[model samples]
Target: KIEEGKLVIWINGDKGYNGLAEVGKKFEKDTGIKVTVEHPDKLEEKFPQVAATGDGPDIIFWAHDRFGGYAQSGLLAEITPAAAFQDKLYPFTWDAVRYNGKLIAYPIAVEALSLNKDLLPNPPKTWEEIPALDKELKAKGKSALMFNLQEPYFTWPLIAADGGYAFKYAAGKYDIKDVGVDNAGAKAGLTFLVDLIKNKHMNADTDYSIAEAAFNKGETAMTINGPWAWSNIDTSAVNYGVTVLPTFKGQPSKPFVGVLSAGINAASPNKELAKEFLENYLLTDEGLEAVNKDKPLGAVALKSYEEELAKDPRIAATMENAQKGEIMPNIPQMSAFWYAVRTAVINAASGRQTVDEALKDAQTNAAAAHAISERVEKQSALLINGTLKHYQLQGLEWMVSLYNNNLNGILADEMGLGKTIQTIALITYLMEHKRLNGPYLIIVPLSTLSNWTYEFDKWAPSVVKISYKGTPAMRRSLVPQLRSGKFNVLLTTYEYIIKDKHILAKIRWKYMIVDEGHRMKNHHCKLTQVLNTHYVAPRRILLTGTPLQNKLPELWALLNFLLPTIFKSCSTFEQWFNAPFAMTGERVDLNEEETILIIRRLHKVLRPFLLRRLKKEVE
Candidate 1:
């Protein structure tokens, strides 16, 4: 039987799943608080619904800003003054959880942008200095900064620091009646962004995966991200420094403070006990530390915890430049504000509109959206065409050089690029030069079998094309013709390769190409291992665009499948790739200059063995 007075809490799946589990166990053991933590599958959607029905858990952990509306609606209890435990946390931490005049929740952590001190030599202390520093970096052919355009949280900090508040606060209430979407301060902040985008100092494409890749690859000198990036950032080779966002227009860049706090459900039978549990568990120093492990969040008690946190380099730097950040207003209208700003910033970044015009439109749309009482939904499409084209050209150029060397190579261009055309061009070049051997194998997606045949005929009319299509009986019947070697190229899919590995492996192919190379990103997978071992080809080519989707390890898989000797393991690559760039000072041998030079040298060496051309380059 369960113990009486036990606290049953619901934490979001992301951090709460693993994070709270570890902490809850310890809390239960140490404090005699029987903590039963339940994590729901669809926490974001389900939490509010459960809370609305008054049947939610005793306590919940979520972003304080995102749950502001719940607090206002009486679903959450306000824990103002927080003085009963105020002496044990960071100042910024306490301030983050304050909504209106009441401290509705306890602060857990803060996120910030960091700079590679070695690459920059002298990092800019304010936003105004970014442009000049960016110019110098670009002149030296290096990136100054990187951030995602799709997330307003990344850019809104700079806007807020420039005296641009998203919503006005007056008389203990948030008043969007005078939202500053198109205020002069906001325009000034966006103008600075325009300058950066135009100069190519910052990346226009800043997805989470891309940001991680750029940092790991040592391609970017600085990036604005959250604590979740610590693992990847720790692997960087550049000497780095962590600080608050630089000042803009004489104000420090203020990031959107995201606070994870506990809320008690009004519907709970044990509301008083639930409130007591929240007050005692999360508000305590031990409880705060439990959540702080492996995270960049600041603790809520300013006087005591701030002093303790100052002893750690990472937390110290983050707390030193901390600002008073309000919990994001959780009013349903807030969604419109976020989406509009995101769209405007992205449009500006992609050169779709001038900064002023984009902001104006975004503000207008946001105002109209807020007027409607219903929920608003917006969808967007991200075109990876341009990025894919660039990698494709680069891959092809490398392949051509290898061909000249009489060595077989793999063109692992990510999806969306026309890998078929590149292969066709390559074959055409080989045939025209009389360097072409006998028949070749072209393994591809089942749906695109006819497309490949059409492309081969269009690009290389002289080359005979054959498809391994039909029922099992028909395919077996064509084995005789396949052995005749009349066709120059053979087409098949990965599915067929696994199904007919014996028959396919028997063919002594001259070259093998793997399309959607990422399908084999997991080197341990049956298909990847089988293809690597079974496919008997003199030369191999792998095609992919998103080579490093989630981790640098993905690159290891590709290289191992195509060219294993170059990289023995993921650890070796991580050490070699990141160590050279993560240093401090201009005089440091492994600074940004040397890092870029090393990359350029590697590219130059690979150029002869590979070819990469973009769409713009083609036209």
Candidate 2:
């Protein structure tokens, strides 16, 4: 039910709670509506799930970067701020809150590093002057400067000033695929950071606390920090002035700017009221001032705050930095960007890799991290050079879907339904679509080895499958072939798997498939024991005609094989289902209600990992 008289806002921590609370009080006085401001624990962690089902707060006050995913997921209302209201926002504010040309949040503030002017009466104007400043500081037993060493937000001004960039922004969008961390400009920027540490001008291992601590104790002449940092420092004890960062070789240092914004949940019942609260009350000059009262937040996003912001040089410096800087990309791919930059900086600073090597790795790694995969279609007769029955194609689709979800499963079709064909097609699909090459292990009864070999030959001859059989000497001869990495598939029997456990354990397998999977229905059997203990594969698929032949424990055995981490204990499984079935040698009687309930619960567990279809349905 909608609370017509009340409105709720969820804040991240308590950074701006008092400021917002005061604003809320003023709003209530004017509008005769109660406003609740809560700085909740785990707001970031809980908001997504809560908002997904339309049960979240009306307003989520958090970083604008997070709204990209939220907006894309349809969890955020598309609120295009009024033209007059938008005019008050800084240019960078628009970039920060907009995703796919849609305004997802109302930009309140922007954060970036500003130079500390307490220790250094006159900040250096150019990068070249840093060396002389460092020498002067050394004479006085002080550091020239200090900033969070590993933080990209702090380091980016230096990197950007040197012409480095993480991604190319053109045509009003970021080209996510064209990662530029390894570009020549980025390499040069990273080298400057490395050299600063090398020349003893900056700390090699200083994080935010270390940097802030050094500045607080007057150990460093200057520190690169934001308004949030200024709020922490006692102004009475430390006489500090905020100034813009220095230029690099005549080029301005532009840091990454973050926007603190207010997003309305798409599912909020009081949408119109929430919009009114944001537009009429929160966006006003008084509202902005109250929210920024204690300087706990970033520089206000409003250009109209020019006169008010000048009163606090910290906010002025931060505002200038925000004006000069690029807004952080508000895409999920930004995760990869953070990861890449962090990796490059840490590796280069630690000397594990040279500056060039580090950035090059960062670029490659980021690309891989966010790479998108094309949808792989179900196998067709034309692609395989032979016809697959319509049911078999569906079976192939099910297996690939499991692979897509990073899961393994059982293909439990009735006997003579061509489970072997489905298995081969899945391997082929992965090879072609996912570019996954393999030394896949297929274990089967020795009797069906030839049939499996023939199926592979007929369906996917491109996959080189080698069978491991014969005398000990012959097996010894074949071990090198398996090790040679030439063969894509390794077809072996249960007897050979145990007999040659030592030999097989050495080679890592991709996908491990066992035909006649019901053989391992008895979890205590030798084949099952050896496979579970010795064989280590990230993915496992069981090929069975009969999934549940006699008992429920057999299904648990298969599930354990597929997902040991989830289907952890057999006793826990039995305890849950044993009541309804009351097993008496597979002849336990169940009433209609009990049978349906038991089947529903049992199918819930089996649904993901098991796929079974009968002959009549397929035909």
Candidate 3:
């Protein structure tokens, strides 16, 4: 009864690593199918090349629309009757594998946004409401939400929620002929994104992997992500809530449904047996039951399974959102659409172009990419902040020189070299000049709150320190009283800012200072993102040494938070900042002349707004 021919299968290494290998072994043992599951290092590369060669796997597990090109090139086998297996799957899951009115593959899993209920007592119902929430959280020195803007998949749901679609879908097929980059709804979505970026309601540069760690660690409040996040999220101390992407302009957030399906190869020796195995073992109720038991994705056959799925609240919430989700189109041209949307959003967020203009450019590029067989334009200078000045430690003096000019500037020193003391000296100088204002907002780390209070007391006793501490009830009572502008300096941590964000948002301060400002590197992290969204003080000063600890992108996050005009894109900074240092071996050296120029320039401008002095100079 054993099959003489080999049945090759292609699986994604991203998932199913060892777990899928076990499943393959089990399947072979039970069915005698002699299945050979190949996990390629680069599925995106290998699968497409194999498909093009007309000698790919007999069955493959991959993303939707990722194989769209193969389908268009007549490299795929249509398996419409797979719909007969629909009774065993979720409606949304089934919808994902269908393309151009044909059933191209079988559904695997689904994804959506979930929330940490402990952080967000009243989860935002719509995208517009997030900024207001962010403002309140910042005042309390806490984070509201976290996300990554650089990844198109993560950001697209927000765009879709605002009634924006990437491509037209008509008559049960995706119409790439009409791109939606310039659609008014899409522009409106981008406008919302701009507000999020400018106000700090969301961070664009944070890595999704790191974000989950932060969220679980209680460093952030809310996070937007997919089903796979369930395993990684920590719920030990938090009550988790699940919901579809919050609505935008009254429309539900339309998350892109990614499907996993099994497809047979045309060149398989056991093509007929493989199809039979797919029909009998993979698409059947028993088969689905086994698969769902292992994977536990959204919607499997037999409504009874829903009860099992509901056992885990997080999974239940994700499954609930899958109802409103739309599967990503499985067309090759769709890749261009993803690229276009990402480029448009990044350009708009980075201030390179108005939302409308960026979208228009993206639309043109996407259209051109589809028609021209020409090589994709080599990416050059994607960073908006490419042309801005970059200074080293010696450049500190040059930065100080600008203090006299009285123009706003950022002293973006790398971390650990006495940034706090330098900032204190600047504040001390302002106090001594008789031109300094009475009230200031100092947003800092919880661990450093006491340090700021002590520093101000030691150096500038004239400035009163108001601390946002004590129990929640105690803080609530103190908030109104503190808003009266009676205190000269308010010392609060990032966590307290989120806790009392609403109260703090009510008052206008003379200056807002962010200490250890690298905490806000991600434009999307709840703390940094929320602070940027609300709180418009007359002046802002960000102090950080060792700004680029994690990556060049981390430096971009810091600069964007402090002097947003300086570093525009992660891609740009990686090339300009890291690449140059790597190539020229000029490791950010700043000579004494550069340092003096920077210091003098800083002194003149900051004479009115900022006052930064090193510990050695001040002492």
Candidate 4:
């Protein structure tokens, strides 16, 4: 029996996955079912919320990393066997889509770094040749190749060429413990990058925007970038050649090639229809043409679609570069790898430190990451049920430093200045993002515990929060809930946290927060040790309106608790703080000029991380 309008497949985003939008119509006539698609630009942020609801969609189209995560989490249906599923596509394409030995997505296109040649009459064959080419380009008053120096995605090819790989890949698996961040090749790669900057081949300020703009205007030579960058180049404005990036000390430049794929949602209602679209229509000639027509999605992996892309030298560029890649690792631990390496690149390229310093920072960070799967879920809008004060969103945005770093930070807004609301908003944002996987251990005075509970209940009722208060007999309800993952945010009095410290220690908290956190101002006391030493979390947030708010040494104490990397020593913190303000002589009474100067300098350093807005000002 032919059933009409019996199937409708919901799509994640429209751009990269646009092929399915038109092909599904053809599928309907031939297969007697329907396909519907949707597109969200920030699909990574949007899909998780929708998919978890189980009413999300019948299918999703996205980059390989996303499909891999969903597959492992059991949120995607496993596609079995080589019978029909593996037809036409390259063998390596399936490697990225497979999770725990099953195919999770129908990968179509591959994207890797491409080096353009037309701008530079002769492309460098090896790493050391770049700077000499830079000198040649500049002698002609043009810039040599430049890139987003602060980006790990751009920096990885150079790093991997020497001796580094993200994680060790073998037998179709990634060994997280085998990070190449500090290996000899990694150091050599970073040193080479720093030398380029030092020798003036690429500017410290060179970034993606600058590189593309400079190349389009014919002011720069070339760059090692992806298809996205090529898409921005106006063909009329610049003629370019595409090929894989250069070698380094004879090792091939191997950037992680990511596959853009489409797959069925694990919870989708129309499963049979979703698979039929993938197996019959989307992967076929008519469907593949629909994919490339509107916009070229790099080079497709299928054998039949290869010629269509070869029609354009630029499109063929992606195909050639992708074939040279080390497919992007699909495991969750790869999340940590990206974060760790990116920080190193940003530091070295920004001229904040030499390359040695940057890779050293990389090693420290990579070690911390080896055992963790750190993917911070990005949330769209910040929504709270109450009268939602203004400036609250900006405060939370600046307060999320811990989400990226290894330390803590302070939201130094004056008390009653709505700091509490901002903190609550940030916590709720983490909850929304699924970054709050490990329960948060919040320590506040006994008096504020009830108020915090009221705020959490007011804003996010779904958050399973428990205040560790009441008599010992009454509080025993926490034993099972803590270990069972039943509660997410644990609000407890300092008195109770200290009393129950041993039990709470079982968990490695995602967040360790202290309300009126300056309460630990006396760092020598045993009580201060709770937030400073005894309690451990990957992130720490201190909310304080205090004496530390005004005193310079107090400021150092606050910074020590918040950002350990910067304020490790008070004498250095004093010198760094006092130099500009000319508080150089003993802490003398600041005259009018000195006081303002000191305050302004301190504010500048703290400006990016501190969200200290006044109520009257925001209102």
Candidate 4 per-residue C-alpha lDDT over 253-286 given as tens digits, one digit per residue, 9 for 90 to 100? 7787878887776777666676677777778767
Worst 10 residues of 1 by lDDT: 375-384
What TM-score does each of the candidates earn?
A: 0.55, 0.61, 0.54, 0.61
Model 2 misplacement above 4 A: 116-118, 369-619
> Given candidate 4, what's the lDDT at residue 155?
75
Q: Say which prediction, candidate 2 or candidate 4, comes out ahead on lDDT.
A: 2
Q: Which stretches of candidate 1 lie over 4 Å from their true place?
A: 1-4, 16-33, 78-83, 87-103, 112-115, 203-209, 236-238, 294-302, 324-326, 369-619
lDDT per model, in order? Answer: 0.63, 0.75, 0.61, 0.68
Cα misplacement distance, residue 168 of candidate 4 (Å): 1.9
Pitting candidate 3 against candidate 4, the one with the higher TM-score is: 4
Per-candidate clashes come to: 44, 0, 80, 4
TM accuracy, model 2: 0.61
For candidate 2, the C-alpha RMSD (Å) to the true structure equals 22.3
How well does candidate 2 score on lDDT at residue 328?
Answer: 77
lDDT of 2 at 17: 82
Estimate, for each residue in 400-514, the C-alpha lDDT of model 1 and write its tens digit. 5555334554454435457787776556555553346467888777767778887766656677766877899988987887788887788888778888887878888877776
Q: Rank the candidates by TM-score, best first.
A: 4, 2, 1, 3
Whole-structure CA lDDT of model 2: 0.75
What is the model-wide C-alpha lDDT for candidate 3?
0.61
**Which is better, 1 or 4, measured by TM-score?**
4
